[PDB]
Design a protein around this ligand. Structure first.
Ligand code: CLA
Ligand code: CLA
Ligand code: CLA
Ligand SMILES: C=Cc1c(C)c2cc3nc(c4c5[nH]c(cc6nc(cc1[nH]2)C(C)=C6CC)c(C)c5C(=O)[C@@H]4C(=O)OC)[C@@H](CCC(=O)OC/C=C(\C)CCC[C@H](C)CCC[C@H](C)CCCC(C)C)[C@@H]3C
Ligand SMILES: CCCCCCCCCCCCCCCCCC(=O)OC[C@H](CO[C@@H]1O[C@H](CO)[C@H](O)[C@H](O)[C@H]1O)OC(=O)CCCCCCCCCCCCCCCCC
Ligand SMILES: CCCCCCCCCCCCCCCCCC(=O)OC[C@H](CO[C@@H]1O[C@H](CO)[C@H](O)[C@H](O)[C@H]1O)OC(=O)CCCCCCCCCCCCCCCCC
Ligand SMILES: CCCCCCCCCCCCCCCCCC(=O)OC[C@H](CO[C@@H]1O[C@H](CO)[C@H](O)[C@H](O)[C@H]1O)OC(=O)CCCCCCCCCCCCCCCCC
Ligand SMILES: CCCCCCCCCCCCCCCC(=O)OC[C@H](CO[C@@H]1O[C@H](CS(=O)(=O)O)[C@@H](O)[C@H](O)[C@H]1O)OC(=O)CCCCCCCCCCCCCCC
Ligand SMILES: CCCCCCCCCCCCCCCC(=O)OC[C@H](CO[C@@H]1O[C@H](CS(=O)(=O)O)[C@@H](O)[C@H](O)[C@H]1O)OC(=O)CCCCCCCCCCCCCCC
Ligand SMILES: CC1=C(/C=C/C(C)=C/C=C/C(C)=C/C=C/C=C(C)/C=C/C=C(C)/C=C/C2=C(C)CCCC2(C)C)C(C)(C)CCC1
Ligand SMILES: CCCCCCCCCCCCO[C@H]1O[C@H](CO)[C@@H](O[C@H]2O[C@H](CO)[C@@H](O)[C@H](O)[C@H]2O)[C@H](O)[C@H]1O
Ligand code: OEX
Ligand SMILES: [Cl-]
Ligand SMILES: [Fe+2]
Lengths: 34, 28, 41, 37, 333, 92, 248, 51, 41, 28, 51
């Protein structure tokens, strides 16, 4: 059951990091008035 | 209870024959 | 007395192909009517 | 992607409709007794 | 151009069939796993001991349930509010015996709906719109969160959450009325007024707008075919509808400004649902509705009954019969 | 069970069964509830009413208070579904 | 941890959730005790470690009565604790005569196939006779005990029928209350019964600590399962494990 | 017997259900005979009536 | 347990209107194709 | 045996929803 | 018992019918036990066999 925990933790951290670093990539400038 | 099914099938066949004979595409 | 699945088998196998054939004929007639410019398109 | 030049139309006249209906009904009449057993 | 820049350009692109965005990175996986688990559990799950008294209840189709009676049973009462992931069980069979799937489904689903709200705002921002649709969507999210998470937190056990089934909601409502005397809480009255008024206003708006259509088809064509995608026509020939509403009732009551009309349409049901969700959340901490039992007495001192006493009798009947084998002591604290 | 013959001896009459009745059945005999009834309902089966006087640890006072009401007692066969709940049977 | 002296050195906040509370302690030594008169075994603990249910299986073209292993569907709630009794000697042998304590615990196990088998693990009303006059490595004792009903008389089935309370008929089917015979075909399910079972246990001592007056060893037990208020045929269960006791 | 048959609650039209389909014979069966009128008496001989 | 006629009721009452609506849509599309001169008549 | 009917109906509804979303008439 | 079960005519694949639908358990049921081997003898002890 430990291997399942490892895989789930990997997936969760991958997606959460995607979210976090996506919002840091100068998001406010991505508007049609650039 | 299956007599209903048999009767329905026979009556449907007769209806099909009637429609084929009297409501037909003209040979012309 | 008899098998129960036979009701479903007979009724479905009679009703489905009949409606398929009627569908084919009706769509043919509609296409023919549409090709000739008339009151019904 | 685009308009396929291989599409065609399907036809069925009344005589073939009558033949198909008769075939289906007669086949069902023949096999119903054996299906019910 | 770096690889990360190309990925960011694809994610926030407006050319996709369905917008992804960065809230989508959380919305899609959680909703998909919740959907898969819910379907599998609703079809083929074994019975679950919900009350902690070793009396399992069947809820799947394969175990003798129909669509109306089937459900996904909440977790066991012995667990309480404890976290129960799959890897914390000795075996998958034990996980299924103690109502494991309920926690997984509800948690991944709540995360999904929050991400759905965020995604709505994000697309509104990318398209150049005004950012207030997700504020309107926040009310159903508030209600669902209220029930599913807030009620167990206040009552101290996940087994008191609403079951994921059709008759489970009926059981939830009946027990809730028995124990908390809803229908006398003013917030529930606000919610009922909200839904009734929303339906009334929707019907009125539809009738008024549809009646005032201008003639462009004649007879042999559905009236819906007269409108073209991109046509310029304000959504009501005024003289007709305005005079109709001014004559139907007191004339000084007539919305002649479209902005105010649509703002009121948006405002009424959303506020009602907010109030009823807050009512549920507050009753989760045992602040019940009005109590008027035995409030009218004669000169001597005998009690004269009212309708509230009949409601109380129904509540007593519901109370003494729920969870028959679970209680050992006189008070249901 | 559907049919139980000695249902009238559980506290609904003037006679109390010593082997199956709950402690609340003794509340209608003055001077007996909290002291002697607790000793009676927590000891083994009795083959006769006279066997209640052999309980190890009975003080005198309990002996004469039981002697006063001896005429209201009886001892029937032990039913395990009733004898297990003699201190608390869920009635309040 | 392993011994009682190490367990007493921890705090409750330090043990919560670890799973140590359901374990049984360990003894270190090989001495002899010899109980005086008026001795009492106090603080007995019994912990099972394997479960099996009797069934019929196929080995090769044949069927036999074999005990198949089962998995515990419940969690760490199956250890008996606090058992006390009074020791005595008859003819040079020790007799236990269990009296009180936490001597019962419900348990559910699942068989290969999906069937769930609940039972009441207990040692209530146990009289065990030994083969010697002193507690030493190699001492053995065992005896019969009585198994009560899984559900008492206050339980109500999903239709509201019970033993000493509830309905006595199937109120959902009023059409079965006609004729000279009414619902006589549902009498088995309308008439709830509560009958006692039986069991057997055998224990052997391995370690004895004289300065602490403690013993420990292994056991093998067998008993009958739940009967669902007399509506089903009970099964048979076999268990194995360890035990601990104090002669103080 | 015909007069007594009308005094049975199974013949009440307001006693069925919406999705219980079939004839009335599908619920109770086919009536065959009358059993008689029962009279309940207590230990003193007075007559009792079931509500 | 369950009533047997429910099988026939559910299956027939689900299958027949579906084919009816499909026939309506297909004949409409065929007439539209026929009206506009093309390779498919 | 009715579980088959229930499953078939639910999966058919899901198929209808899929076709409605992804094979749709262009709004233009 | 497994070896004896193979010697029963009900397990012959050439013993069925075209329109007899279902599993083989639908014809005879589910087997439980083997009764044994019968031996027939006449008045002189000579063994007989059924064709
Ligand atoms: C967007 C991705 C996403 C997210 C957020 C979650 C979230 C969750 N999953 Mg899930 N899951 C996902 C995708 C996701 N899932 C997918 C794709 C699969 C299929 C492989 C699964 C399969 C799965 C299983 C099988 C289980 C879960 C479980 C859980 C819960 C606990 C997970 C945990 O301990 O993580 C730990 C993660 C961390 C410690 C890292 C977090 C660090 C940052 C800083 C977060 C801080 C946030 C804080 C509150 C502020 C949680 C609600 C478990 C559950 O519901 O049990 C009841 C469970 O058993 N998930
Ligand atoms: C005529 C009488 C009447 C009326 C009109 C109402 C009206 C209401 N009652 Mg009510 N009630 C009544 C009698 C009545 N009651 C009686 C007699 C009792 C006692 C038995 C109760 C007991 C009762 C309880 C116990 C509760 C209510 C609640 C409610 C409210 C429902 C909240 C809701 O649906 O929106 C909320 C909207 C949602 C929950 C939807 C969320 C949608 C999520 C976010 C997304 C879902 C997407 C989905 C999964 C996937 C879509 C499929 C996809 C293919 C498209 C509503 C105001 C509830 C309430 O106040 O809510 C907080 C509540 O908890 N009532
Ligand atoms: C003569 C018909 C009639 C009338 C005048 C009312 C009037 C009212 N009902 Mg009511 N009601 C009716 C029939 C009626 N009801 C029926 C037939 C039912 C179902 C049995 C209900 C169920 C119902 C519920 C459950 C609730 C009301 C409530 C209300 C009050 C606010 C509703 C509101 O403004 O909605 C908006 C409409 C126009 C703006 C209002 C006094 C609510 C209330 O506040 O009670 C005090 C409430 O909680 N009613
Ligand atoms: C019970 C009533 C009710 C339901 C079911 C409902 C449903 C919905 N409303 C939506 C939107 C809205 N509703 C709104 C206002 C309101 N909505 C109301 C009442 C409801 N609205 C009311 C009263 C109001 C007025 C305040 C607004 C303003 C919006 C939106 O903007 C939004 C929308 O986009 O609508 C067009 C949609 C959001 C889709 C989504 O989450 O992604 C889809 C999610 C999917 C496909 C996956 C979920 C599947 C999950 C995992 C299933 C398992 C978990 C469930 C809880 C199972 C429980 C089932 C039992 C309870 C039977 C959805 C169709
Ligand atoms: C198109 C529309 C749909 C058409 C319907 C199909 C037309 C009917 C054809 C199916 C006839 C089967 C009816 C059997 C009657 C019935 O009651 O069945 C009932 C039985 C089921 O039998 C039930 O089985 C259950 C399962 O355990 C339980 O045992 C029940 O007791 C038992 O009654 O149906 C069958 O046995 C399955 C029929 C389908 C078998 C597939 C075809 C068999 C393989 C032959 C293929 C060779 C083809 C060669 C071609 C040259
Ligand atoms: C369960 C699934 C049932 C099997 C479904 C078979 C798929 C049928 C093939 C699609 C037929 C189709 O496209 O229309 C084929 C024709 C329509 O014909 C199409 O018309 C179009 C109109 O522009 C174009 O002209 C196409 O070229 C022409 O093929 O209609 C049919 O006859 C439909 C029959 C489908 C009826 C289903 C009966 C199910 C039994
Ligand atoms: C179009 C395609 C066909 C569509 C199908 C129609 C949808 C299904 C609707 C049929 C519903 C019947 C389902 C019951 C199934 C069942 O087991 O039946 C089974 C039962 C038959 O019951 C059997 O009967 C047998 C003959 O005596 C024997 O008695 C058997 O013992 C008994 O079981 O069906 C019925 O009782 C008849 C159903 C039809 C009744 C007609 C409608 C009733 C009148 C109400 C009309 C009011 C409407 C107001 C609306 C506003
Ligand atoms: C659950 C049990 C019952 C089953 C019922 C049915 C359940 C089915 C669930 C899964 C079906 C839906 C997912 C598959 C559809 C899909 O991925 O479309 C998604 C499309 C296609 O993707 C991409 O593909 C398209 C073509 S391409 O990329 O340009 O080549 C492009 O147009 C689009 O913009 C681009 O995003 O776009 C996305 O959002 C990514
Ligand atoms: C005693 C204090 C205790 C707290 C009380 C709080 C009261 C707050 C009142 C002010 C709040 C904002 C008022 C509306 C602003 C706005 O959105 O304009 C929108 C328009 C204003 O009119 C439009 O106004 C326009 C002029 S102007 O721009 O608004 O100046 C005009 O052009 C147009 O014709 C006209 O339709 O208002 C409406 O049409 C929407 C109706 C709902 C808005 C609230 C109206 C008053 C409610 C009273 C309180 C009800 C309590 C309910 C309890 C559940
Ligand atoms: C990559 C990516 C993406 C995508 C994503 C996705 C698409 C995902 C999916 C996901 C998924 C798709 C998931 C799923 C999962 C699932 C699960 C997790 C399930 C589970 C289940 C279970 C657990 C079950 C169980 C059971 C029961 C209940 C009963 C019977 C028995 C059994 C055991 C079977 C995106 C776009 C965002 C972008 C970024 C990147
Ligand atoms: C594909 C996903 C759906 C699964 C198939 C649904 C139809 C079969 O599902 C099944 O459910 C029960 C499973 O115990 C069966 O219940 C019974 O099935 C057999 C019938 O021959 C019996 O001999 C078995 O004792 C029992 O399993 C139902 O007869 C059937 O309906
Ligand atoms: O879980 Mn649902 O309902 Ca809240 O009170 Mn106690 O617990 Mn149970 O009883 Mn009453
Ligand atoms: Cl309690
Ligand atoms: Fe509009």
């Amino acid at each position: 059951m430990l291997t399942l925990k490892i895989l789930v933790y990997t997936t969760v951290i991958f997606f959460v990091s995607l979210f976090i670093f996506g919002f840091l990539s100068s998001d406010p400038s991505r508007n049609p008035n650039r | 209870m299956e007599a209903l099914v048999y009767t329905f099938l026979l009556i449907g066949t007769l209806m099909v024959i009637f429609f084929a004979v009297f409501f037909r595409d003209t040979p012309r | 007395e008899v098998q129960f699945g036979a009701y479903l088998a007979v009724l479905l196998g009679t009703f489905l192909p009949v409606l398929f054939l009627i569908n084919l004929y009706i769509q043919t007639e509609s296409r023919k009517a549409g090709r000739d410019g008339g009151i019904d398109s | 992607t685009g308009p396929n030049p291989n599409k065609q139309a399907v036809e069925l006249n009344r005589t073939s409709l009558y033949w198909g209906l008769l075939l289906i009904f007669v086949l069902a009449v023949l096999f119903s007794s054996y299906f019910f057993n | 151009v770096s690889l990360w820049e190309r990925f960011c350009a694809w994610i926030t692109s407006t050319e996709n069939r369905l917008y992804i965005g960065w809230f989508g990175c959380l919305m899609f996986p959680t909703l998909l796993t919740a959907t898969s688990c819910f379907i599998i559990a609703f079809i083929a799950a074994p019975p679950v001991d919900i009350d902690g008294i070793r009396e399992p209840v069947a809820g799947s189709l394969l175990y003798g349930n129909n669509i109306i009676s089937g459900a996904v049973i909440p977790s066991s009462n012995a667990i309480g509010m404890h976290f129960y992931p799959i890897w914390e069980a000795a075996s998958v069979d034990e996980w299924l015996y103690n109502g494991g799937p309920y926690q997984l489904i509800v948690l991944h689903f709540l995360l999904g709906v929050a991400s759905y709200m965020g995604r709505e705002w994000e697309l509104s921002y990318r398209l150049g719109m005004r950012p207030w649709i997700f504020v309107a969507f926040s009310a159903p999210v508030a209600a669902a969160s209220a029930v599913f998470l807030v009620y167990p937190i206040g009552q101290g056990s996940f087994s008191d959450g609403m079951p994921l089934g059709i008759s489970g909601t009926f059981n939830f409502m009946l027990v809730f009325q028995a124990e908390h005397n809803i229908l006398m809480h003013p917030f529930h009255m606000a919610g009922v007024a909200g839904v009734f008024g929303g339906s009334l206003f929707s019907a009125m708006h539809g009738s008024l707008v549809t009646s005032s259509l201008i003639r462009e088809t004649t007879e042999n064509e559905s009236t819906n075919y007269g409108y073209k995608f991109g046509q310029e026509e304000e959504t009501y020939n005024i003289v007709a509808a305005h005079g109709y509403f001014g004559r139907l009732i007191f004339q000084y009551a007539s919305f002649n400004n479209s902005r105010a009309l649509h703002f009121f349409l948006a405002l009424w049901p959303v506020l009602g649902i907010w109030l009823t969700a807050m009512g549920i959340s507050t009753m989760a901490f045992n602040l019940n509705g009005f109590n008027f039992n035995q409030s009218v007495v004669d000169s001597q001192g005998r009690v004269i009954n009212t309708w509230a006493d009949i409601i109380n009798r129904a509540d007593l009947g519901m109370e003494v019969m729920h969870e028959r084998n679970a209680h050992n002591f006189p008070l249901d604290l | 069970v559907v049919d139980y013959e000695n249902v009238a001896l559980l506290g609904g009459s003037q006679t109390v069964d010593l082997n199956n009745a709950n402690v609340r059945a003794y509340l209608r005999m003055p001077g007996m509830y909290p002291a002697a009834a607790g000793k009676i309902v927590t000891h083994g089966p009795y083959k006769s009413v006279a066997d209640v006087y052999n309980i190890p640890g009975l003080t005198n006072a309990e002996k004469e208070v039981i002697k006063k009401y001896e005429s209201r007692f009886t001892a029937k066969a032990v039913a395990p579904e009733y004898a297990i709940d003699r201190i608390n049977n869920g009635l309040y | 941890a392993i011994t009682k002296s190490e367990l007493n050195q921890l705090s409750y906040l330090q043990v919560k959730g670890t799973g140590l509370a359901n374990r049984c302690s360990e003894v270190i030594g090989e001495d002899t005790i010899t109980p005086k008169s008026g001795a009492r075994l106090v603080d007995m603990c019994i912990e099972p470690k394997a479960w099996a249910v009797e069934e019929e299986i196929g080995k090769a073209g044949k069927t036999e009565k074999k005990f198949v292993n089962s998995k515990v569907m419940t969690r760490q709630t199956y250890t008996l604790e606090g058992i006390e009794g009074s020791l005595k000697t008859d003819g040079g042998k020790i007799v236990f005569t269990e009296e009180e304590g936490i001597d019962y615990a419900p348990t559910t196990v699942q068989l290969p196939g999906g069937e769930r088998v609940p039972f009441l693990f207990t040692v209530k009303e146990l009289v065990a006779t030994g083969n010697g006059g002193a507690f030493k490595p190699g001492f053995q004792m065992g005896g019969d005990f009585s198994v009560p009903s899984y559900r008492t008389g206050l339980f109500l089935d999903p239709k509201g029928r019970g033993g000493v309370t509830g309905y006595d008929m199937a109120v959902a089917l009023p059409g079965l209350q006609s004729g000279e015979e009414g619902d006589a075909e549902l009498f088995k399910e309308n008439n709830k019964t509560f009958e006692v079972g039986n069991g057997r246990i055998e224990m052997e001592v391995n370690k004895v600590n004289a300065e602490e007056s403690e013993i420990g060893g292994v056991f093998v037990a067998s008993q009958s399962g739940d009967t669902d208020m007399g509506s089903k045929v009970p099964k048979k269960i076999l268990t194995k494990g360890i035990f601990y006791a104090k002669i103080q | 017997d015909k007069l007594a048959f009308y005094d049975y609650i199974g013949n009440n039209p307001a006693k069925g259900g919406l999705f219980r389909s079939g004839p009335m014979d599908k619920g109770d069966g086919i009536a065959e005979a009358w059993l008689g009128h029962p009279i309940f008496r207590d230990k003193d001989g007075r007559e009792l009536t079931v509500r």
